[PDB]
Design a protein around this ligand. Structure first.
Ligand SMILES: N#Cc1ccc(CN(Cc2nnc(O)o2)C(=O)CSc2ccccc2Cl)cc1
Ligand SMILES: N#Cc1ccc(CN(Cc2nnc(O)o2)C(=O)CSc2ccccc2Cl)cc1
Ligand SMILES: N#Cc1ccc(CN(Cc2nnc(O)o2)C(=O)CSc2ccccc2Cl)cc1
Ligand SMILES: [Cl-]
Ligand SMILES: [Cl-]
Ligand SMILES: [Cl-]
Ligand SMILES: [Cl-]
Ligand SMILES: [Cl-]
Ligand SMILES: [Cl-]
Ligand SMILES: [Cl-]
Ligand SMILES: [Cl-]
Ligand SMILES: [Cl-]
Ligand SMILES: [Cl-]
Ligand SMILES: [Cl-]
Ligand SMILES: [Cl-]
Ligand SMILES: [Cl-]
Ligand SMILES: [Cl-]
Lengths: 258, 258, 258
């Protein structure tokens, strides 16, 4: 059997590395580039301009590289960039983003995007993220490394999801989630930090201790964001993980989840 | 490139306008009628008795015209009627409704039904509505003109969604939503009115002022629904926009969302 | 019209009863077994080792028999077992479970799994259940007979859903649901007993009265779980349906939904 199934539709302008697999009844549209070791399943719709990296897996009934609704004018160049070693499960929908304003939809490496998850236009996903079933990013959402968004997490446009943060199932996020923070409910509320994920990553006892103290400064001692940021300056300069936490609060444009 | 893809299945009883486009591996079932300028994507399942009007676009993995789940008797005539200039995104599910008791599923014009949204049996959608991704109408839901249901809004059976109303993302609507009202949460709660939409629609400042006063009469002045409807009578006779609001509270069978 | 559509793919290792129907562009993967009178629609992905029983109906865009993430080692035997007279609606996702530890994913008889519902690895569904649209069982979830989970009900791993229990739409279940109990919200809260379900099943007036009495003992009389179970002992001995209620609280491992 051929690597590229004869029942698939491959546009002449698509560029696939020699060992790429495409399942039956899949469509690889114009301006779609697929890197080495990528496996496209059956019944997949790929639309471009889209660049897919190496060793990716894209499952049936997914629509990857869908139109950007934002378009300032008809024919504005758009793009979707996907990195390496990602898993895109069944029914996933991923929209492209605008090139001109550096707002392309981009996905990094080692991500797991589970069944029927949705990635809205201009969203940026880092590395080692998990977007569980039916998680939806409205648009212009930034998801930093190692974030875990539990099943049916909804993210309002322009929200930033901090590195190593966690949302509980069915969370509705309207504000920025600082790095490491665990959020739950509709509307989302901050509960704690994902200390479990810190240990799995091999954070030192001292870095975990400073992060636990950092959480209290921000959420449990009646400080304003401005006051909290000044109180964390000292710890952030000493612990890169605390600087990650402080930086996410500093870069919050929609306020932080409380 | 042939308008009807040779890989599509067109039932001999289906009725199509000459320029209808049908993508590969799509099924246009028995008793499906498709109008001028409509584009059916690839991998679409159309089931009848269904009428799809002019200049519609139906995306991949959608199942349009599915069975009504609660017939009085087996073989009871059912129908789905879709108007013109609608966009039905990928994975959308739309069920038919019973003809006899005038409970057909009907969709008007210029609607946008986004990915994996669900339109249950006997639902009635007006014009210029937006049902964002994964919005679900359980059945017998009335959506009036210009309503916007944000992503993952769930609507209980028999609920009425008023004209120009708005639900926040992840809203679980169990009661009627009066016209212009903005609702949020699970269970949904009334917050304000969509004054933004009124301005985009070109409403006069006097109509907006009368609607703002109307919201207070119903929600912020400790009145009963009967008391509110009586106080609104004078304003409603003067502003058609206030009559739209008053009529939506009058026609509420499940009570109004508070 | 050929029972196995010539556009479907039947793996040479798949075992089918003679009268099985397979729609166009459907895949009956390796190690899939299908029983008498079963109808596979078009665009279905079946993956094994999976056993599908008799008189089942599987709708388009479903992925049934998907990989279990829970794997002790590569090549560990996995299985999905589906009984008879079930209806699996469009876009439904069902994962296999591990054999070695008696944790296979199993579905009994006469079940209705509605559009885009998700059955996570090692989940066990009994008979006559209804999983409404987009209900998601995270994994290791046990759903007893006649349970109804309303649209978008989310179920945390290891939860038990009792016989004849009910969840409201958009419920986020984190704890066990005792038999007959109705739950609502995110997080889910106990409200009452499913009296309509009791009436539909033709329960005696004495049984419906003893169950209403049982609910109050557990939830509205300030007793602890150990205190409630002791008071229930008498009514449970006389009424088998009260024993069903008592047994579900006794066998709770995540505490009971309150
Ligand atoms: N790879 C991985 C992975 C998966 C889930 C999570 C987080 N997680 C808990 C969990 N861990 N393993 C399982 O199966 O679930 C949830 O999102 C629960 S909700 C849910 C879960 C699955 C489907 C639908 C829904 Cl709604 C973390 C990592
Ligand atoms: N055409 C249009 C259109 C789209 C959305 C809305 C309403 N809206 C806000 C918004 N506006 N533009 C964007 O992308 O989102 C949401 O529903 C947010 S939630 C959401 C959004 C998208 C996917 C999944 C989810 Cl969960 C209003 C109009
Ligand atoms: N066969 C059956 C069956 C169906 C639903 C229920 C429970 N149920 C109420 C209801 N009863 N008939 C209808 O149509 O809805 C809901 O889940 C409402 S929410 C919902 C409903 C449908 C789609 C999406 C959503 Cl979100 C019980 C039994
Ligand atoms: Cl998945
Ligand atoms: Cl988008
Ligand atoms: Cl959770
Ligand atoms: Cl027409
Ligand atoms: Cl969409
Ligand atoms: Cl329906
Ligand atoms: Cl919102
Ligand atoms: Cl508002
Ligand atoms: Cl405004
Ligand atoms: Cl069998
Ligand atoms: Cl799989
Ligand atoms: Cl369904
Ligand atoms: Cl799973
Ligand atoms: Cl409900």
């Amino acid at each position: 059997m051929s690597l590229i199934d004869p029942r698939a539709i491959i546009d002449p302008s698509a560029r696939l590395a020699a060992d790429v697999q495409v399942g039956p009844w899949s469509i690889v549209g114009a301006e779609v580039e697929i890197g080495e070791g990528t496996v496209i399943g059956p019944h997949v719709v790929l639309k471009g301009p889209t660049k897919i990296g190496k060793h990716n897996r894209i499952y049936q009934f997914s629509s990857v590289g869908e139109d950007t609704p934002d378009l300032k004018y008809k024919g504005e160049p758009t793009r979707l960039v996907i990195g390496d070693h990602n898993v895109i499960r069944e029914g996933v929908t991923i929209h492209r983003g605008t090139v001109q304003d550096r707002a392309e939809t981009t996905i990094g490496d080692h991500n797991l995007i589970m069944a029927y998850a949705h990635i809205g236009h201009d969203s940026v996903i880092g590395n080692h993220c998990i977007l569980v079933n039916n998680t939806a990013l409205a648009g212009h959402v930034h998801v930093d490394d190692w974030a875990i968004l539990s099943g049916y997490t909804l993210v309002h446009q322009y929200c930033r999801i901090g590195a190593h943060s966690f949302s509980g199932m069915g969370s509705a996020i309207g504000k920025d989630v600082p790095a490491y923070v665990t959020v739950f409910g509709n509307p989302a509320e901050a509960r704690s930090m994902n200390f479990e994920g810190m240990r799995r990553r091999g954070f030192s006892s001292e870095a975990i201790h400073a992060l636990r103290r950092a959480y209290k400064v921000v959420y449990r001692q009646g400080h304003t964001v401005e006051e909290a940021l000044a109180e964390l300056a000292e710890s952030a300069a000493q612990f890169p993980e605390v600087a990650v936490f402080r930086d996410s609060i500093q870069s919050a444009t929609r306020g932080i989840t409380r």
